[PDB]
Amino acid sequence: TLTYPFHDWSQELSPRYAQLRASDAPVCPVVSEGTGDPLWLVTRYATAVKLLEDSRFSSEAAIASGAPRQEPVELRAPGTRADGVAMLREAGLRSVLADGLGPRAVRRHQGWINDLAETLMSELASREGTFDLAADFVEPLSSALVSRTLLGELSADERDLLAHCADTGLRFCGVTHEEQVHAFTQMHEFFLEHARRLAGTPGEHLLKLIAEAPVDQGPLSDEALAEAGSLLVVAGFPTSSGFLCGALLTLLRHPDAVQELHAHPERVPSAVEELLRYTPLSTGSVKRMATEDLEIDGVRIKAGEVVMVSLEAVNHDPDAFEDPDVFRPGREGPMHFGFGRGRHFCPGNRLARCVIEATVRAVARRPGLRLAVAPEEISWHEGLFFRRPRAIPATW
Numbered sequence: 001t002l003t004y005p006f007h008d009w010s011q012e013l014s015p016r017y018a019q020l021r022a023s024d025a026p027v028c029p030v031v032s033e034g035t036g037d038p039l040w041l042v043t044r045y046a047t048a049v050k051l052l053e054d055s056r057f058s059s060e061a062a063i064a065s066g067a068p069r070q071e072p073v074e075l076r077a078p079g080t081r082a083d084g085v086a087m088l089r090e091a092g093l094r095s096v097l098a099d100g101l102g103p104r105a106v107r108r109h110q111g112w113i114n115d116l117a118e119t120l121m122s123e124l125a126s127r128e129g130t131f132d133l134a135a136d137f138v139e140p141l142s143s144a145l146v147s148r149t150l151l152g153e154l155s156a157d158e159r160d161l162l163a164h165c166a167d168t169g170l171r172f173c174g175v176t177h178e179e180q181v182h183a184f185t186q187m188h189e190f191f192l193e194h195a196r197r198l199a200g201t202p203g204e205h206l207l208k209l210i211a212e213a214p215v216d217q218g219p220l221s222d223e224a225l226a227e228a229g230s231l232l233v234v235a236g237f238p239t240s241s242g243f244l245c246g247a248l249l250t251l252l253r254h255p256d257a258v259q260e261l262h263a264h265p266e267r268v269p270s271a272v273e274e275l276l277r278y279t280p281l282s283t284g285s286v287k288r289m290a291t292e293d294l295e296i297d298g299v300r301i302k303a304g305e306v307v308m309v310s311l312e313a314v315n316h317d318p319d320a321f322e323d324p325d326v327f328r329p330g331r332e333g334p335m336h337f338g339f340g341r342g343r344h345f346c347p348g349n350r351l352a353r354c355v356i357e358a359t360v361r362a363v364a365r366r367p368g369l370r371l372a373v374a375p376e377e378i379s380w381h382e383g384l385f386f387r388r389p390r391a392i393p394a395t396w
């Protein structure tokens, strides 16, 4: 019956999420608009915990070529595996993510990240007119994050190529299927040519750490490095840029909350966590394949079927959060789902929280920052997996 996704490309969540959440069944059938595949959809917090903590519902099997899927094309250059995390597991490197992405990486990078956030915001505060927080703040900050922490030194042309491929490939619609496949082919061909060199540029970026990691087999090949490059782009680039843009819109809409953060900087970490709950990001869902015949809260799922969890729907579940549609940094609720749950909890969470915190603090230190247009005049890219406005006109 209901086709998926729900076309809610702005920060207004589709009403279909609450409608399914309040239905009797804890899992609801939908149909992929792009493929016609039947899919299951979970929208309730309690059910999502149980599903995402169950290793019998496999992420790798839902990523694999040939799986039923919500996305209109396979997210891979044809003929490639295109599962960088599985590649790291086969290589024995799952721990290298911790070194390049965990608290050790945050210690290494937090200083320059905050220096850059303040440098960008201070320059905007010096301008005699308006500016665009998306292009003038989020783009340089997120580009620096990807280069310095993930890929290595990138030229502006290389950064633009990778950003184009991410925006073209990671879509439910708005491009033809052939252009979407070509975006992944373009990015894979870029990394086949350049991943080795990038891994050798100065810095402690994750791609270097992967290339230099001790492996029981040989040190990783150029093909393995290329798989890692595409993973890091799709997981790190449009997510960070979309989230930072959305978080800025949330802050600009809540001046009373920003004033409290200005007066009490020790409350910023709680506001970061509330932004991760409140600010929607993906227009799709995390998903898992049943590896055998299973039951989730009484509903039978056959082996090979795919079950989706909308993190936005879970983060807005009123059985978990009181007044879920209110931005409330003081909130004393359960853990949010903005980074997922269980064994697949975002390994980028530490670096993401550091860049989000640096952005929140840069805003909170300078009262009066506001939208320069009406909030309904904000224009959205339509069809991206990871929501992003076309521009955020702003001023003091």
Ligand code: HEM
Pocket: 059, 085, 150, 231, 232, 235, 236, 237, 239, 240, 243, 244, 281, 286, 287, 311, 337, 338, 339, 340, 341, 343, 344, 345, 346, 347, 348, 349, 351, 352
């Ligand atoms: C605000 C920014 C970000 C958000 C909201 C976010 C969110 C998430 C979420 C919800 C998942 C779970 C997907 C699932 O359960 O299938 C995930 C996984 C992942 N994230 Fe992040 N992420 C962000 C930034 C980053 C960054 C900067 C990196 C750097 C490489 C990264 C790397 C990854 C990887 C590799 C995975 C896959 C983990 C797995 O499948 O086991 N993320 N992210």
Ligand SMILES: O=C1N[C@@H](Cc2c[nH]c3ccccc23)C(=O)N2CCC[C@@H]12
Pocket: 059, 063, 075, 082, 083, 084, 085, 170, 231, 234, 235
């Ligand atoms: O490591 C993975 N995990 C899941 C979730 C995901 C996390 N970040 C993503 C970015 C875009 C699409 C999906 C995801 C996935 O679907 N994957 C294919 C591309 C990255 C790979």
Ligand SMILES: O=C1N[C@@H](Cc2c[nH]c3ccccc23)C(=O)N2CCC[C@@H]12
Pocket: 070, 071, 239, 281, 282, 283, 284, 285, 286, 287, 311, 385, 386
């Ligand atoms: O929109 C998507 N979201 C991720 C999961 C995710 C949900 N929220 C996230 C936030 C950050 C990274 C990944 C996710 C995913 O698996 N996808 C397969 C095709 C569509 C694509």
Ligand SMILES: [Mg+2]
Pocket: 066, 067, 068
């Ligand atoms: Mg199949």
